[PDB]
Enzyme design. Structure first.
Site, mmCIF file in Angstrom:
data_model
loop_
_atom_site.group_PDB
_atom_site.id
_atom_site.type_symbol
_atom_site.label_atom_id
_atom_site.label_comp_id
_atom_site.label_asym_id
_atom_site.label_seq_id
_atom_site.Cartn_x
_atom_site.Cartn_y
_atom_site.Cartn_z
ATOM 1 N N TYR A 248 -9.644 -1.221 -2.474
ATOM 2 C CA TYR A 248 -9.462 -3.443 -1.984
ATOM 3 C C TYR A 248 -8.692 -2.949 -0.277
ATOM 4 O O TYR A 248 -9.025 -1.320 0.326
ATOM 5 C CB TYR A 248 -8.136 -3.557 -2.542
ATOM 6 C CG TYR A 248 -6.911 -2.562 -1.759
ATOM 7 C CD1 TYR A 248 -6.220 -2.110 -2.269
ATOM 8 C CD2 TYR A 248 -6.067 -4.116 -0.750
ATOM 9 C CE1 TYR A 248 -4.963 -0.907 -2.106
ATOM 10 C CE2 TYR A 248 -4.742 -3.459 -0.602
ATOM 11 C CZ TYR A 248 -4.216 -1.909 -0.873
ATOM 12 O OH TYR A 248 -2.855 -1.239 -0.261
ATOM 13 N N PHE B 194 -3.579 -4.879 8.036
ATOM 14 C CA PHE B 194 -2.964 -4.288 7.520
ATOM 15 C C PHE B 194 -2.680 -3.566 6.590
ATOM 16 O O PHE B 194 -1.831 -2.314 6.259
ATOM 17 C CB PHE B 194 -2.044 -5.350 6.991
ATOM 18 C CG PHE B 194 -1.652 -6.184 5.843
ATOM 19 C CD1 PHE B 194 -2.827 -6.944 6.217
ATOM 20 C CD2 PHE B 194 -0.999 -5.971 4.875
ATOM 21 C CE1 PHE B 194 -3.210 -7.522 4.216
ATOM 22 C CE2 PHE B 194 -1.070 -6.314 3.778
ATOM 23 C CZ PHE B 194 -1.970 -7.397 3.367
ATOM 24 N N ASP B 195 -3.467 -3.055 5.313
ATOM 25 C CA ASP B 195 -4.093 -2.696 4.323
ATOM 26 C C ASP B 195 -5.145 -2.366 3.965
ATOM 27 O O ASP B 195 -6.163 -2.524 4.087
ATOM 28 C CB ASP B 195 -3.224 -3.325 2.919
ATOM 29 C CG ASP B 195 -1.343 -2.511 2.464
ATOM 30 O OD1 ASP B 195 -1.372 -2.948 4.408
ATOM 31 O OD2 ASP B 195 -1.427 -3.795 1.637
ATOM 32 N N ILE C 248 1.772 -7.866 -7.568
ATOM 33 C CA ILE C 248 1.758 -9.752 -7.520
ATOM 34 C C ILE C 248 1.406 -10.528 -7.954
ATOM 35 O O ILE C 248 0.033 -10.250 -8.333
ATOM 36 C CB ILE C 248 2.288 -9.513 -5.740
ATOM 37 C CG1 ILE C 248 3.012 -8.879 -4.953
ATOM 38 C CG2 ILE C 248 3.162 -11.184 -5.417
ATOM 39 C CD1 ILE C 248 2.610 -8.679 -3.766
ATOM 40 N N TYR D 222 5.453 -13.375 -2.358
ATOM 41 C CA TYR D 222 6.493 -13.040 -0.781
ATOM 42 C C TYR D 222 6.571 -14.709 -0.019
ATOM 43 O O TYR D 222 6.153 -14.854 1.192
ATOM 44 C CB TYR D 222 6.407 -11.906 0.110
ATOM 45 C CG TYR D 222 6.092 -10.893 -1.114
ATOM 46 C CD1 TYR D 222 7.321 -10.004 -1.908
ATOM 47 C CD2 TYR D 222 4.718 -10.062 -0.340
ATOM 48 C CE1 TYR D 222 6.870 -9.295 -2.138
ATOM 49 C CE2 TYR D 222 5.082 -8.833 -1.659
ATOM 50 C CZ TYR D 222 5.698 -8.089 -2.369
ATOM 51 O OH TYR D 222 5.667 -7.305 -2.693
ATOM 52 N N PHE E 70 -7.957 -10.583 0.530
ATOM 53 C CA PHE E 70 -8.330 -9.391 0.651
ATOM 54 C C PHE E 70 -9.810 -9.710 -0.517
ATOM 55 O O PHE E 70 -9.999 -10.484 -0.888
ATOM 56 C CB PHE E 70 -7.273 -9.085 -1.053
ATOM 57 C CG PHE E 70 -6.121 -9.300 -0.751
ATOM 58 C CD1 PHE E 70 -5.014 -9.743 -1.186
ATOM 59 C CD2 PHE E 70 -5.458 -7.481 -1.021
ATOM 60 C CE1 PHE E 70 -3.783 -9.815 -0.365
ATOM 61 C CE2 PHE E 70 -4.529 -7.425 -0.476
ATOM 62 C CZ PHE E 70 -3.330 -8.452 -0.525
#
Lengths: 273, 89, 771, 107, 48, 194
Positions: D26, D36-37, D56, D82, D99
């Site tokens: 991913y 960020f990821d 999540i 979140y 994503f």
């Protein structure tokens, strides 16, 4: 000297003086042999330093007298602008530490002189009087519109008072950790005047050196005061004055507090703009 | 208790092997007395001949002449001074 | 905008270099929660392409490299560098065949071989951000990075940087030779002290620094380097000399197995041989004093008196003779460059004759380095008593305690926060269920745990803000005192501050001070007299000091505090009397230091009688409005104070065979103690009856329980005494029998509480006066 | 409610259910265009299995609908990942997360 | 109000007092006892 | 060697107990340029504090007082402790005159500071008009001497009742008269100068 055993005395009434931890001096009529005191002269390099604060204190009580004569009444005694503008950079040269190129033998002796020099001064004023004059100097924001209460000679020298006042306030807190501990009681006063648009070059390196010296001041700043620093970070360019202060606030004496660690990762970091 | 506290083959080997070295210290390296210290100092003394710059022992002496004039009411107890004062003593 | 373009603008790289020091100021001091979060910001390949980049500027070149060690592998180096000098080896099968010299009198190459020191893992956890959020997390630990790819990148930079330095490049990588060689060596020193590399990849760095002596181009040490880059070289050679010191203690730890495995069967052959040798009468017990008299750490010193008293045969004396002279030759003495003992000895003087230093850290660092390898024998002699050996079936118990000691000294250099109270106390409670806490009491003396538990106490004691932690810090110590007894006097010089901050709910730091004077007389009579008036200073303070615990609660006002000074006497009594024998010095100094204090006594005899306090005390304990109107009671503290007062005067008296002798003053404290306290005030309190339960059972914190009755019966016994009988038929007229038949009425906590009295006190009173 | 858009066509043969380990390679990127990821920076495939409440719930239902060789695009609203405050230092509160996923192997 | 204290205030600025007589001519001479003087306050600056 | 004493001012630690062995070592032999090395260097520096270090360091010495004696008189008979232990006599030490080597070395340092018969040092050591503080070491040493004699006189009056005196009491006498051996002439090499 030392072989004196003398007392001070009257010439007309003819009676000596002693007391009855602080002991009040009185004119006692009995008297005893506890008045045979020995004469000691102290060091002569700070006597004129004790007199120059007397002379400038007679200047500054006049400055307390003159400024609030027009503070409560608008105007549509002469003030000594030329006398107070040049009184302070000689104190800046008086309080500025020596450079790094000296040997450790002669430089640390002058450093140990200058520390107890300002510790000698901080008993008799010297750190209350600066905010006691700037407390109603910072109440007006403009340079010539709001500062029209005194005259054009004050409207032209609006800036050159406060950029030396904050430099003097920083040189008080340069290095020494014994007198910054009493500025821990109104820390909101130094953290609420950053974006006032005038004299931002003194207060930032005041707040830089209040956090290096003592660890008794950094257990007070929680999240209500830490975003004003991010506000000046975003409102007055990309400085190196504004990030080393957060590098210094977190770590102290080789031990950190984590009630101050992630509080900037809460705000400054996840925005990424 | 001294009449019949238990002998050495009743306590195990891992308890015996530590009773070993604590007495080995007081028996074998405690009695060694040599003069390793005159060999080190004349090297730093004869280092003045090379091919008015400070000698390597005078570097240590001017180091220890100003590590103690710090602004401090209590002087720092160091690791190496209690060794080295005995060395050049 | 490229990072390659900040080498000419002079403005944005002074800003960006100081963004990283704030990035390692937040990821420092063992803080691991934002070390996970900043990995998403600045991550793995952004580090790993950029470190092997070469056109980077100097300050950012050093700053990103120090960031990449502070964000990942500095929470794992503190736990290993804080315990590298403590030596515990198991006696596993890998610790029986090790020589000090490699077989094949030549010195072996340092740092390699096989080491078996008990050290915990670094416990690496994989970083992830798509995980579910909890709720307060119990433990958050360091991110995991594949070090198998970085283990060669930690070497190749040095390997081609030195052929650059031998080529003497004018404008090298980073702008100067200082920015060439300072960051990658501080990179390699942390992994070298953390122990990631094996034994044949540190073969290459010893080919690197010195390819002339270390053989099984130009070296690193014979170039001219600036004075700011080669302190990490002193650190790594300090590490090399540290494991060179480890090899000696590992070999001698093998020999500690070897010599007792040699002689403990010679010992039973000796006992079986001379067990039936009855040809000697006056000498048999003299050789049996070798068998049964000497202590087990005394026969070991009796064993090795072979130098220049030894019943041991002449075939067993020479293997340690060949061992220890080989250890001498392994050290600096040749015992009648080629090795690293002659490599770096001529290196410090080489660097010192070059130029004058400017720094106060390098002239301390390598001057601590060469004295190490010169007095290697003296450094071994001060590192070996802090080394212990554990049988290898306890490794799975002891690595938990070593991780817990890596945790408590990872947390002592962080200041105590909101949820830092529970991770302290479950760690020191994980100490309690370990079953090495009581098997061996003295490996903890080598680990140094017993002062790190009070260095964290003096942080929160200097009002108090942590009421949970103090009764848990002394909880560890109060059990630490009585597992053995040579741990007691490691705490005795601490008593100038152990009871300096005692004057709380639960337990207070005076409990360990009372445990510092129990169970031996030589720990009892060796108190200095200057550390005892401070107890009666607090007692004279509370003799008219009111309680801050009562007026803030809302309970009625008494001008002095009975329970505030009640356990100031319990420490004093255990300091005076231990185990059936009185002290002859401290019992003389306690009484006149007590009785010139007018406020240390009660307000009755300061002048009403003794029963005039207790008759009001019982009735104000019966009245609900006069008492407290939750466990603290003014109706029971008033009598508990008196019971702590009187019995110390009872057993502070000297013994009876000092009465008939020529003691000129031992009778006098007796006389003044019978003169200040009267005798007819004893018979009233021994005559006062009970409110015995019958069919209810009354309160034990609001009625007269016999804990206070157990004081005057011993105050009657030997300091007042009985000689004739007209008082003997009156001390047991009402004193014992209306209450002993009350025991007979129900022969129930009060009943056994008074049988404590009946089988502790009154029967040694009448057995000694049976004639 | 999550919108899914495929990127490259895959199998359409195996989509996961309970009792199945899965690997997803991913990448993450917020709505204002910032990184960020990722797992590209790792050279590791992320390994987890569905129904362990690990991911999540805005991802645990989108990871059970794809197949082998399938690159998809999932735009998660802030209500499903979140919502209130979130992870400190990672995502600002109430920001959408996007994503682009790829399933590697293992059903 | 004039007080007397310990040693911590005994190194400060306003514990210091100076000697000057009444006449102007050669006032900085070695005096004897029996010469009227004045006790000088130097920091705030008001005579005692 | 001197400024590490001057920055101490009242700490009888273990580093003083080596930096005075170095002082014995470098002042042994009766050398005069080692004296003229020190004199000008102390007089033109004008930093008093080494003399208050010597003022405070010699009165924090241990005396033959007889309340800290009869307790270890009984504690010395206890040779065998239980729970598989032996007496750590080296870790206990002698509690009576535990400061013997410290004042043994300090008095020989002040001995060999003035053994060279150089009388500017003797006028110096008592009268310092160049500094603002006199410290007057010799009457401090003689008050030390009279504290010694009114210690050991009552030490003698404590055991005048018993005729035959045994071992450890007279060994405690021996390591006290051994420091008396040097304090008895440490004020004679202040007075044999002309």
């Amino acid at each position: 000297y030392g072989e004196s055993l003398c007392f001070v005395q009257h010439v007309a009434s003819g009676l000596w003086l002693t007391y009855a931890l602080k002991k009040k001096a009185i004119l006692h009529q009995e008297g005893h042999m506890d008045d045979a005191l020995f004469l000691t002269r102290c060091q002569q390099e700070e006597s004129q330093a004790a007199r120059m604060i007397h002379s400038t204190a007679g200047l500054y009580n006049q400055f307390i007298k003159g400024l609030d004569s027009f503070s409560g009444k608008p105007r549509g005694p002469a003030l000594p602008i030329e006398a107070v503008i040049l009184s302070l950079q000689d104190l800046i040269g008086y309080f500025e530490p020596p450079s790094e190129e000296l040997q450790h033998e002669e430089k640390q002796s002058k450093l140990r002189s200058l520390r107890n020099r300002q510790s000698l001064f901080q008993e008799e004023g010297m750190l209350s009087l600066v905010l006691n004059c700037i407390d109603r100097l910072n109440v007006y924001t403009t340079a010539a519109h709001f500062a029209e209460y005194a005259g054009e000679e004050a409207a032209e020298s609006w800036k050159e008072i406060v950029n030396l006042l904050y430099e003097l306030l920083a040189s008080l807190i340069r290095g020494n950790r014994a007198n910054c501990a009493l500025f821990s009681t109104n820390l909101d006063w130094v953290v609420s005047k950053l974006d006032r648009l005038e004299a931002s070059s003194g207060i930032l390196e005041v707040l830089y050196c209040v956090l290096i010296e003592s660890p008794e001041v950094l257990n007070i700043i929680q999240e209500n005061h830490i975003k004003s620093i991010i506000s000046l970070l975003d409102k007055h360019g990309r400085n190196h004055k504004v990030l080393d202060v957060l590098c210094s606030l977190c770590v102290c004496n080789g031990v950190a507090v984590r009630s101050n660690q992630d509080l900037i990762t809460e705000n400054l970091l996840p925005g990424r703009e | 208790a001294c009449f019949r506290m238990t002998p050495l083959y009743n306590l195990p080997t891992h308890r015996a092997c530590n009773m070993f070295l604590e007495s080995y210290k007081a028996a074998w390296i405690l009695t060694e007395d040599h003069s390793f210290e005159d060999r080190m100092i004349d090297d730093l003394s004869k280092a003045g001949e090379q091919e008015k710059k400070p000698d390597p022992l005078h570097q240590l002496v001017l180091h220890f002449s100003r590590t103690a004039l710090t602004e401090k009411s209590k002087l720092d107890e160091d690791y190496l001074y209690m060794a080295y004062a005995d060395i050049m003593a | 905008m490229d990072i390659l373009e900040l080498s000419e603008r002079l403005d944005l790289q002074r800003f960006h270099s100081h963004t990283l020091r704030l990035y390692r100021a937040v990821c420092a001091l063992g803080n691991n929660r934002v070390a996970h979060a900043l990995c998403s910001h600045v991550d793995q390949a952004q580090l790993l392409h950029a470190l092997e980049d070469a056109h980077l500027p100097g300050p950012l070149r050093a700053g990103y490299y120090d960031l990449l060690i502070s964000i990942h592998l500095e929470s794992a180096c503190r736990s290993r560098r804080s315990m590298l000098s403590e030596y515990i080896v198991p006696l596993t099968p890998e610790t029986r065949a090790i020589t000090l010299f490699p077989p094949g009198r030549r010195h072996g190459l340092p740092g390699v071989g096989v080491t078996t020191s008990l050290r915990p893992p670094h416990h690496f956890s994989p970083p992830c951000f798509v995980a579910a959020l909890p709720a307060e997390a119990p433990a958050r630990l360091s991110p995991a990075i594949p070090l198998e790819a970085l283990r060669d990148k930690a070497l190749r930079m040095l390997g081609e940087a030195v052929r650059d330095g031998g080529q003497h490049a004018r404008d090298p990588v980073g702008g100067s030779v200082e920015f060439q060689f300072v960051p990658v060596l501080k990179l390699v020193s942390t992994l070298l002290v953390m122990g990631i590399f094996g034994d044949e990849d540190v073969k290459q760095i010893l080919k690197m620094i010195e390819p002339e002596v270390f053989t099984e181009e130009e070296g690193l040490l014979q170039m001219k380097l600036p004075e700011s880059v080669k302190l990490q070289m002193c650190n790594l050679l300090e590490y090399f000399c540290d494991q060179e010191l480890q090899h000696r203690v590992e070999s001698l730890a093998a020999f500690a197995e070897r010599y007792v495995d040699k002689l403990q069967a010679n010992q039973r052959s000796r006992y079986a041989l001379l067990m039936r040798a009855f040809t000697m009468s006056a000498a048999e017990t003299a050789r049996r004093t070798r068998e049964f008299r000497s202590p087990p750490q005394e026969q070991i010193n009796m064993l090795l008196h072979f130098k220049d008293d030894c019943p041991l045969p002449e075939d067993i004396r020479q293997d340690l003779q060949d061992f220890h002279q080989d250890l001498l030759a392994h050290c600096g003495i040749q015992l009648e460059p080629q090795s690293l003992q002659e490599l770096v000895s001529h290196m410090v003087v080489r660097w010192a004759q070059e130029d004058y230093v400017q720094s106060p850290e390098l002239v301390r660092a390598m001057f601590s380095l060469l004295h190490r390898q010169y007095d290697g024998l003296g450094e071994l002699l001060r590192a070996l008593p802090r080394a212990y050996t554990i049988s290898p079936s306890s490794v799975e118990d002891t690595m938990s305690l070593l991780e817990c000691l890596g945790q408590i000294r990872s947390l002592l250099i962080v200041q105590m926060g909101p949820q830092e109270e529970n991770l302290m106390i479950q760690s020191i409670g994980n100490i309690m269920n370990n079953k090495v806490f009581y098997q061996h009491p003295n490996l903890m003396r080598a680990l140094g745990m017993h002062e790190t538990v009070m260095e964290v106490m003096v942080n929160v004691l200097g009002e108090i803000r942590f009421p949970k932690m103090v009764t848990s810090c002394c909880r560890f110590l109060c059990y630490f005192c009585r597992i053995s007894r040579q741990n007691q006097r490691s705490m005795f010089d601490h008593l100038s501050y152990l009871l300096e901050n005692s004057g709380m709910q639960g337990s207070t730091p005076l409990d360990v001070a009372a445990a510092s004077v129990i169970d031996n007389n030589e720990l009892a009579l060796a108190l200095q007299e200057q550390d005892l008036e401070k107890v009666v200073s607090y007692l004279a303070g509370c003799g008219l000091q009111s309680c801050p615990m009562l007026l803030a609660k809302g309970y009625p006002d008494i001008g002095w505090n009975p329970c505030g000074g009640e356990r100031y006497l319990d420490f004093l009594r255990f300091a005076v009397f231990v185990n059936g024998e009185s002290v002859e010095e401290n019992a003389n100094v306690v009484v006149r230091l007590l009785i010139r204090k007018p406020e240390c006594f009660g307000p009755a005899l300061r002048g009403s009688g003794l029963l005039a306090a207790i008759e009001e005390a019982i009735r104000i304990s019966e009245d609900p409005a006069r008492d407290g109107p939750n466990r603290v009671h003014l109706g029971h503290a008033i009598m508990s104070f008196y019971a702590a007062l009187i019995d110390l005067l009872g057993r502070c008296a000297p013994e009876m065979h000092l009465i008939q002798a020529g003691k000129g003053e031992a009778l006098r404290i007796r006389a003044i103690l019978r003169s200040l306290v009267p005798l007819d005030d004893l018979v009233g309190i021994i005559s006062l009856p009970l409110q015995i339960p019958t069919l209810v059972q009354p309160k034990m914190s609001a009625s007269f329980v016999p804990d206070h009755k157990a004081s005057m019966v011993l105050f009657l016994d030997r300091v007042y005494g009985i000689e004739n009988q007209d008082f003997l038929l009156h001390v047991l007229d009402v004193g014992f029998l209306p209450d002993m038949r009350a025991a007979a009425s129900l022969d129930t906590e009060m009943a056994l509480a008074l049988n404590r009295y009946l089988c502790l006190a009154v029967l040694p009173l009448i057995t000694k006066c049976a004639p | 409610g999550v919108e899914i858009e495929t990127i490259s066509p895959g199998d359409g043969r195996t989509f996961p259910k309970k009792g199945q380990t899965c690997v997803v390679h991913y990448t993450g990127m917020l709505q204002n265009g910032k990184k960020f990821d990722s797992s590209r920076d790792r050279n590791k495939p992320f390994k987890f299995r569905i129904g362990k409440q690990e991911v999540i719930k805005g991802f645990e239902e989108g990871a059970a609908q794809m197949s082998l060789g399938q690159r998809a695009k999932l735009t998660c609203t802030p209500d499903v990942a979140y919502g209130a405050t979130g992870h400190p230092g990672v995502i600002p509160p109430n920001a959408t997360l996007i994503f682009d996923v790829e399933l590697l192997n293992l059903e | 109000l004039v007080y007397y204290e310990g040693g911590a205030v005994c190194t400060h600025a306003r514990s210091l007092w100076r000697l000057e007589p009444l006449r102007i001519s050669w006032s900085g001479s070695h005096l004897r006892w029996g010469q009227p003087l004045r006790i000088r306050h130097v920091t705030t600056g008001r005579y005692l | 060697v001197l400024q590490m004493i001057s920055a101490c001012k009242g700490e009888t630690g273990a580093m003083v107990s080596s930096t005075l062995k170095l002082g014995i070592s470098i002042l042994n032999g009766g050398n005069a340029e080692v004296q003229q090395k020190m004199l000008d260097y102390l007089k033109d520096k004008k930093e008093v504090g080494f003399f208050q270090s010597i003022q405070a360091l010699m009165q924090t010495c241990s005396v033959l007082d007889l309340n800290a004696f009869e307790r270890q008189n009984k504690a010395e008979g206890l040779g065998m402790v239980n729970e598989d232990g032996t007496v750590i006599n080296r870790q206990n030490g002698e509690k009576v005159m535990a400061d013997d080597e410290f004042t043994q070395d300090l008095f020989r340092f002040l001995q060999l500071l003035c053994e060279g018969h150089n009388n500017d040092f003797q006028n110096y050591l008592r009268t310092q008009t160049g500094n603002t503080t006199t410290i007057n070491i010799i009457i401090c040493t003689v008050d030390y001497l009279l504290r010694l004699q009114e210690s050991i006189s009552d030490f003698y009056w404590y055991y005048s009742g018993k005729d035959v005196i045994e071992e450890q009491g007279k060994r405690n006498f021996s390591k006290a008269m051994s420091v008396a051996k040097q304090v008895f002439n440490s004020l004679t090499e202040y007075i044999q100068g002309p």
